[PDB]
Symmetry: C2
Subunit: 309 residues, 2 copies
């Protein structure tokens, strides 16, 4: 039985798995009122990718495909973005996935850059024409239907968008007005339920909360200190995916350690479905050193009593 393990990278050395951002802190809070069901950054401890999760960091919340026309012009140009899988393959809507891999997994107005590289070269030119422009992909729009193969991408007054191969690089949120990181988009549009979902996560043992890896997410404008939380860092997903170490029970006991002092700082449960719980009530800061990281100790069960974090 290959021994299970987690990376030794510090949070200052890894990346958020729900948006391509550095990780700024650990964070916990009660979530009884909330359904925590993200679809990116989902992996079992044996390395099974779930939801829309894929391995390439810059493809998290990216879109790739081509523009084919538009509906809405003048003041706000709204282009028909036919989306493909990140590997360039045509997306098959009957694949057993919620949406193309990497699709945003939250309600919001994602701000980024729409880039195009034309598929042919004009006679005598040094290569194909290119253009990049600010754009927003609103995941709450009725035209956000990635599971059906298309989303709408908007460029405001920019009308210089061609029917050409197109990539969307995410940068942040247009504003915080309609952002809810825990509400899933309707991947097939209105009146059709989502499918293929990574399961919702919640603590089952009294006194426990989920532990999150938190990143600040930029805003194009507006007031707020917006952030996005993932269940495990992208590097952990890549680690489990390669290791495929057998899960001996449903719960791995992991301990956060200071490698300089050698001191164990707190303990946590790492669950088979790929999330962490800790013994803590409330939202107060998690005071840990920058050099700290988790270390697998042993396999336990759902009833293991954690020391208070």
């Amino acid at each position: 039985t290959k021994p299970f393990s987690v990376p030794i990278l510090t949070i200052g050395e890894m990346t958020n798995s729900r948006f391509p951002l550095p990780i700024d802190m650990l964070y916990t809070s009660p979530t009884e009122n909330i359904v925590v069901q993200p679809q990116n950054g989902r992996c079992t401890l044996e390395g099974e990718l779930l939801g829309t999760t894929q391995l390439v960091t810059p493809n998290i919340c990216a879109l790739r495909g081509e523009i084919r026309g538009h509906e809405g012009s003048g003041d706000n140009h709204k282009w028909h973005f036919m989306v493909r899988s990140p590997n360039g393959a045509a997306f098959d809507p009957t694949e057993d996935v919620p949406a193309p891999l990497g699709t945003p997994d939250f309600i919001g107005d994602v701000f980024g850059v729409l880039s195009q590289r034309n598929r042919n070269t004009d006679s005598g030119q040094s290569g194909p024409a290119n253009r990049s422009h600010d754009a927003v992909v609103s995941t709450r729009d009725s035209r956000f239907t990635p599971k059906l193969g298309s989303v709408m991408i908007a460029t405001w007054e920019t009308s210089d968008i061609q029917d050409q191969p197109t990539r969307f690089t995410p940068v942040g949120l247009e504003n915080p007005d309609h952002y809810n990181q825990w509400q899933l988009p309707n991947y097939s549009g209105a009146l059709t339920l989502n499918m293929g979902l990574a399961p919702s996560v919640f603590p089952t043992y009294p006194g426990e909360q989920i532990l999150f890896f938190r990143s600040y997410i930029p805003l194009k404008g507006g007031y707020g200190d917006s952030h996005i939380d993932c269940l495990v860092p992208q590097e952990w997903i890549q680690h489990f995916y390669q290791e495929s170490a057998p899960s001996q029970t449903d719960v791995a006991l992991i301990r956060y350690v200071n490698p300089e002092t050698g001191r164990v700082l707190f303990e946590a449960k790492l669950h088979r479905q790929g999330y962490i719980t800790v013994a803590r009530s409330g939202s107060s800061p998690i005071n840990v050193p920058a050099n700290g990281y988790f270390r697998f100790d042993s396999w336990v069960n759902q009833f293991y009593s954690l020391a208070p974090m």
Copy 2:
């Protein structure tokens, strides 16, 4: 835990010189080029070199504070006081070329400048924010990140405050002045660079460097621009954590198809963190998308590779 490389496919990792998926393997002669990138540099024992750091979205990112305009007479140009990615002040006397993640090529890097004010106004629920398209020209005379500042240019001419600022890289403004193998002058004109990761070149006859190639977006202009790294970012993160002792100067690695089990070609993985193969010219490297390298054994500079 002897030496190993990741089993991820190129379709599963990321360029170490710009935050991009990797599109193909690529090789070509480089006798008339100096290959001395400063990002994506790591020894096989896990020693990061040059400006290399571990966070993918910090590759070619900049973090710090805007402090007014750069010089006078151009309201498009801002004085960007740069800091280390972890928030610490950058010490120009540290033995590195520049702040970690600084771009390592000559070009006009296009991206987004984002600001979040350090205070919340009474009556508002959080700090004010603004983001604007921006260019960091690494050929500018005011590109002096080793001295603690760069000039950042915007199309916006007023809506930029003296507030905490981060630059998210996206691509190149155009291909006109891009040269991926020419280093910037990190301290500006007439001062040499310091603390450099060493240049790499094939010393064995018949060999070429093997590159991991990514297409890089252009804001405008004509071209199919790309950027090449020596090893993927995931390899850097792997070696950094494993810290496996290098038994010789050369690890023999073989590219394998895990479905058929068949070994496809062999390559030298050098102690300083780059790959050479026995190939002449720049014709395509015909391998399956599921292929990956596997460590075979420690050899030496004399080993004769099978023709790739």
